[PDB]
Design a protein around this ligand. Sequence first.
Ligand SMILES: [Cl-]
Lengths: 149, 149, 149, 150, 156, 149
Amino acid sequence: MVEQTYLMIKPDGIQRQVVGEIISRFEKRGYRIAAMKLTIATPAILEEHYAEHKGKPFLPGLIEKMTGPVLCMVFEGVDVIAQARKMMGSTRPGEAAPGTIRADFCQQAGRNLIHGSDSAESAKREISLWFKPEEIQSYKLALSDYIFE
Amino acid sequence: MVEQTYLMIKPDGIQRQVVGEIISRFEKRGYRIAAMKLTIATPAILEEHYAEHKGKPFLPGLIEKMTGPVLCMVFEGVDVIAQARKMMGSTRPGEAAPGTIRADFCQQAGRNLIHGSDSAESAKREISLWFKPEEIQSYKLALSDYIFE
Amino acid sequence: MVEQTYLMIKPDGIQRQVVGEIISRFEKRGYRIAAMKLTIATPAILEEHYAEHKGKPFLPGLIEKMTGPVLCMVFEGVDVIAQARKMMGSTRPGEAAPGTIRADFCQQAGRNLIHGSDSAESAKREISLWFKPEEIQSYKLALSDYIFE
Amino acid sequence: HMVEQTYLMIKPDGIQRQVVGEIISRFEKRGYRIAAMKLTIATPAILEEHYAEHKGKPFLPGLIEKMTGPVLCMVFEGVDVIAQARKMMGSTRPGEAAPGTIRADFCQQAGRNLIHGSDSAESAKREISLWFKPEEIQSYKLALSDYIFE
Amino acid sequence: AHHHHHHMVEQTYLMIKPDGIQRQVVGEIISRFEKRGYRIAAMKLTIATPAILEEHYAEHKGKPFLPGLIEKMTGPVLCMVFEGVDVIAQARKMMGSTRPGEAAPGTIRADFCQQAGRNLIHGSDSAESAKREISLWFKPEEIQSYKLALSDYIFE
Amino acid sequence: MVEQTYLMIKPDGIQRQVVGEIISRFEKRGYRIAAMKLTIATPAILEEHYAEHKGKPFLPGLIEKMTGPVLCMVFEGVDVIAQARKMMGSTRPGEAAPGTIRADFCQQAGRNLIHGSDSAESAKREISLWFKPEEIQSYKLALSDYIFE
Ligand SMILES: [Cl-]
C-alpha cells in the first residue's frame, strides 16, 4: 500500500530557482511523480487551501506571500504523507533538523519553500483542489522491485 | 530580449528518476519556468508532435518510445532555443559533448532523455500543441538584474 | 586508534546505480577503503553472513532479495563501526534520521540499500567471511594529519 | 526583520582537504549573506586570544599547534545566524554530531573538526573584531531578500 | 512498446590510480560511469606492484619514461570493468585527454587534474587491450554477469 | 613550476549566491587558494583594473555593473592562468563550452559571473592592484604528491 501526498513548491522555491533540487530529494527515495503542474496561485484558491486558518490574524499575510508562481505536485510512496512532512522539517526553519528542506534552504516560516499535506484527509482535499482528476497519471516505476519489499 | 523553448522529459527521464537534475540544469542559467505539466503522451499527440517525420519508417518507433509519462516544460531565456539544444547535446549520446545532458546520462539516441525545440517556429508549434494558453505563466525572476545585461 | 567495519551494498544499491554516491559518503569523512570487491552473493554465503537469523520467518525472503550483485567493502576510521551504523540510519527507512543513507534513498526495510556490521565481533567475523587476508590493503591516507587528531 | 552576524572560520583541515567551497555553499544555501571573507595564516598569538576561554587547560597547546596554518575567516549574516550556524556545524565532537551537519558529514575527531563558529552574541562581536578590521566588513543587500525574509 | 532492442555491448578495463584513491574521489568517479547506465561487471581494490604494472604497460617496454610511470602507479588502485554500448571509446572520451590541461571541460581529467603524471584514471584504448587488461588484473570468476533492471530505459 | 592567477567573482556571482560552487570548481583540480578577500569594488579601482579599455564606449557600463560586492581571489597551480580562462569559458556565455562556468551559469556577457587574468603580465598587475603583499599566503598543499608530477 502506497499513498499520495500533495506537495507544493511556494513562490520562494520558484524564485530562488531550487525547483529541481526539491524534486530530486523526493525522487531519490523512489517516490513517483503522479502529478505536476506550474500555476500562479490566486487568493481564492489559497483561501480554500488554507481554510483551516479562516479568520486568523496571520491569514492575509500568508495569502499575500503565496500569491505567485507555485509548482503543484503529487508524489506516491509508502507512508509518503508523513515521510514528506519529515523531509520538509519544522515549519520554522530555525527549528528544523539538518538534512530537511527547510533547515537546509530557509530562515523564516513565512518563506519556508514548500507545503505538504498533513494527513490522508488533507491530501485528498488538496489534490482535488489543485488538480483535475485527469491530471493524475497512473504508471509504474521500472525499479519498483528494488524499491518496495 | 528573451524567447521560450519547449523541453520535454521523455519516459526514460521519468523512469530513471532524474527529473529534478534535468530541471536544475536549466534553472542554473537563470532560465525561467514558464510552464510545466506531467502527462502521459498518447499516439495522437505524438504523431502531431513528430509530424515532420510522417511517412518515414522510423516514426512508429519514435511514437512507441514516447508513449508513457512525460514532463512537458517551457523555459524562457536569452537565445534559449539554441542554448537548450547545446545543453542537451547531439541526438546520439555517443556523439554529444561531455557536460551535455545526453553525454552525461545516456548511451543511445532512442533513449536520450529529453526533447527540445529545434527552432523558433518549432518552439511556437510545440508549445501550442502541448499547452493551452492559460497554462503559460508570466512572472519576473527576482534575480533578473543579475542575469540579464 | 582506528578500526575496520564491513559494509555491503545490497542488490538494490547496485541496480539503482547509487554505488558511487554510497562510497562518497564514507570517503567524505576520511574513512579509508581497505578492501572492495564486487561479487554475486550465493545462498550459502548469505546463510553464514546472516547466521544469527537462522530459523527466523523472514530469512528465506532476505536471502532471496540478497541473491544478486553486492559490493563488499571494508572501511577504516575512528569508531567506524558505530559511526557507519549511524550514517546508514535505522533498519526501517521511515524511522531513520534525515541525512542518513536509508532516509535519503529508501522506503522499506526489505530494500534498505546497505548492510554494516553491528559490533567489533561481527565486523571481524564478516570481514573474514567475505575477504581473504591478502585482499585487505594497508596504506596511509595522504591527508591523515588533517583527519586524525 | 532583525539579522545578526557570526564569525565562522574554516580551520587548516578545511583548507587542506579543499572543501572550502562546499562549506561556503552550505551557508549560502540558506540565504545567509557573506559580510566578510579573507584567507590568512593563523598565528599562536592570535589563537591564544581567540581561545582565551581555555587558558591554562592542558589541551590548549595542542589546539594552538593544530590551528597554526591557513584559515578562512568569514562573517555570515542572517536571522538567528549565530545559533543556526552552530546547528549546521553540529557537535564539536563529530561522532556525536547529527547526520547532515558539517562535522558529522566530513569529520571523525574533535581536534580536526573543520570549522569554528561563535557560540554567543558576545563571542561573535569579540571574534569578528579580533580577526577583521572594520573596513573588511562589507554592507550590501541580497537581491533575493524578499524571498528569504518575512 | 518500451522494451529495448538487442545491442552488442563492450567491456572496458578502468583503473582508478593511486591519486584517485588518495584524493578520495573514488565514489565520484564511479558515479560518472553509473550515470550513463554502464554496468559494473567487476571491481576490486588492490595495491599495484612494479611487476604487474610492467605487464600492464607492456607497450611502453624499454621506453625512458616507464620507470617514473611505474613509481607513480605503485600504490592502491581500484580495478574496474564497466559494460555498455561502445563503452571502450566512450570511457576514453569521458576521461579526457592524457594531459588534463588539454582535456575538454566536463571530462574527469579536466575537472580533477593538472598534469599527465597524476591524471587519476586509466582506461583501455581498444577491445584487444581491454581483453588483455581484464585478464591481467582480474580472475575469470571475478567478472560478474547480471542484467540492469533499467535496461529498457537505458537502451533503445 | 606553478603560477598564480587573479580570479574575481563579480557582483552577480555574489548575489546569485554561487560563491562556494565557483570556489569548489578550482579546488577540485588541486589549485591552492593563495589569497581571498571580499570587498566592494569602486569605480576608481575598476578603471585601473580595466585600463586596457580606457576610452572605449562600453567601459562606463562595465564599471557600473562591477560596482558592488566582489570576491577577490588568487589561485595557484600549473598553467593556472590559461586553465582558469578555459574553465570560465568564453566571455559570451552563449559561445562558451558546456561544462564551463559561463555556459553552466550565465546567459549574457554583461553578467558572466567571474573575471580571470588573461596573461602572466595581467595576473601580476591584477594581483598587485587588488591585494596587499601581506594578504598573499604561502603554504603547501598536503595533497601535492598526488596533484603534481
Ligand atoms: Cl520562523
